[PDB]
Design a protein around this ligand. Sequence first.
Ligand SMILES: CCCCCCCCOCCOCCOCCOCCO
Lengths: 272, 274, 262
Amino acid sequence: PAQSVSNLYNEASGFFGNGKFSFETGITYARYDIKADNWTLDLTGAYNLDNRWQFDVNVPVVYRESTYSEESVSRDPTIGDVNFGIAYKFLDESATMPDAVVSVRVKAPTGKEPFGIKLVYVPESLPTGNGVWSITPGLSMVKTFDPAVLFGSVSYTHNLEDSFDDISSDVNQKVGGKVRLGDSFQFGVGVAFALNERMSMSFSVSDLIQRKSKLKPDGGWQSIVSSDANAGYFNVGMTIAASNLTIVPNLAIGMTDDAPDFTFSLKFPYYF
Amino acid sequence: AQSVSNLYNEASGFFGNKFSFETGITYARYDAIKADNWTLDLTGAYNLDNRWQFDVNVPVVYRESTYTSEESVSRDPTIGDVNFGIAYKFLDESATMPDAVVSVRVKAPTGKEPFGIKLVRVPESLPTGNGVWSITPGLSMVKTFDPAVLFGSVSYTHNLEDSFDDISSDVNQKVGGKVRLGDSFQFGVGVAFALNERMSMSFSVSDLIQRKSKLKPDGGGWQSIVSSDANAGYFNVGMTIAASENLTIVPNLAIGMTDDAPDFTFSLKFPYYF
Amino acid sequence: PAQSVSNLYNEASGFFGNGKFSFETGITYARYDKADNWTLDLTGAYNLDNRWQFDVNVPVVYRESTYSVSRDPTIGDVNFGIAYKFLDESATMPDAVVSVRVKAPTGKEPFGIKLVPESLPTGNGVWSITPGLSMVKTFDPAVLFGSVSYTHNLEDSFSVNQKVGGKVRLGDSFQFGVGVAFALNERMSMSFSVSDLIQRKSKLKPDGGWQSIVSSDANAGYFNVGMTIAASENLTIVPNLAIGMTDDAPDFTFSLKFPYYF
Ligand SMILES: CCCCCCCCOCCOCCOCCOCCO
């Protein structure tokens, strides 16, 4: 099973199932237009049991400079909302069947919370995480139809309701409350080709819908306006085989207002 | 070559593979005022000796727009502007020469006119059409340079003048009048490959330029509307997928480039070919 | 050979490999949001032995910035370019090339214009040395390729009720891109690429002290889909869509160019 195909399948299927363990460094620039430059170092380890089950942690690391006639704000490399996945390959591909993988991705509020950030207007700091617990079930198909590998994916992210000491952006008020960050549905599809024994290329489109954030001061449920979100991405990416070592570059053209203008990913999946 | 022919149908606008029925779900996202527009197209088409083609399209228009606080407007499954189309394929592809099709698109103002809709200060309602007739002549050429299939396409939209009971956005007033919607030009090109016996992919570009719109209130004079004209630009990525070689699944992303065009537009078309 | 893999390189690399004298004429449309810009680029070129290439480019610019101001066709910023290949590709190496472009301020400078403003400019109005490195390399069938450049702008001396006059320093600019290309058949190729221009801020000193212009800083992301189609033995047709990504690019840009190899 040549590395172009197997790198292509890993990337698409979300299921690092070439070896038995796997560690991966990723670096991701994103550009928001408030002008804003955001880099993101990801660190991600995964192990495999019975060719069929996968477990993994991911640790994100976040530098962030936002500019607001103009004044600058910063956040130096902090975590990160740490997330762990479990994944299960319920269907192995055949002529009649696709490859299929159900998964669940719990994510925890380890990063700096966006709530309580006062306004000395320009923020006194920038966040690194939305401040709540998420749980994201998800599905992904992949099937080779020589020489196009078609692939696709759905997921839904329930956030869990949490409470907070301070939720006033105003510089004089400790107004405590609690927050339901509303749910999201995430859809995406695309097609990939094994260009040669080592290289593979992919075109894909994904979209993300967030269903509006309710809030409750210590008061009644007053939902945050402007908080619901559509986020459209268009992606061109390879897949370049190096050694066990691999480089995976990707561009993400921001089709929506809420998605960043573009985003350059450079991932380095390494397999023991 | 099932995908060659599915590519051409799609590129040309000319069903080669007698009768054709086509159901077409489309989503489109505007955000400049946020808006989520769903369209459903029923289309039926006859084809005569791969030479003449008549067809009819019936759009159906769900719509939802959003204007500290902020109200929303909606618009339940109302049908849009129906249209009949005659296309004549005057060149056959050869070594020397392309695959040429010339066509007219007669488009009738069945949908809910935008004019009159009183702005309840946010609209009272959302339109489903432009309220005027229009005939749009067009050309489309398609030529292989194996395995690259080049294609092109150009059209002009002449809108006819029409009278309305009310052209005013005011709730408090009713001024009837006439309108000339500014005519529009539409150029676009692209390339397409057959990936296998069932599938094709496409990369394409397109532009729509529109002349400005004029009103005439009674009994005043013609007055053109500022910032009414537009240049809607689009980048397309697409595929053909022969499903039962009879059924064809046609997905297509469309990335808006210009503020005048929808942020994106996903499309699904299910040509059924008899 | 082949004629595509040739023309593939010559766009990616910016280097006339397979020719002595070369002349390229091209037309470019760009929409902003309202403005409409066309540019006619007349490029001449000589190349010595897949090793040195010299080239002259004259831009001629027609613009319509609808607030409604025009600027009838007029010469832009004429530029020339010494360019030198320093690695020819092997199984191991890439086709590397180093380049230096001087761009002289032959276009109408933007600094004079008084605020609908009187006229539209057709050039930044200062000189600029502009070095840069290219790579191309075939990993059958993928031709990977990439670019890097800095852009030093030179200082010069030179708003309506009043009329002040002094020195200006245009921001320096780093640029870089990457892309895969394909040889589709004997006559034609297809490309895909990305690039981001990063313009540093711009100081201005009245006849006074150096004041940064807030806003003059910029980031111009672009995404490009392209082709080379071989017409004659020596005429390529080079179409290229360039979808802008950030607010500082144009919404879009088509370019048709026609390099003839004489
Ligand atoms: C809260 C988590 C963020 C939402 C991500 C959901 C995406 C799940 O889609 C399944 C397919 O994913 C494709 C690539 O994912 C790789 C991540 O796992 C690394 C294993 O090597």
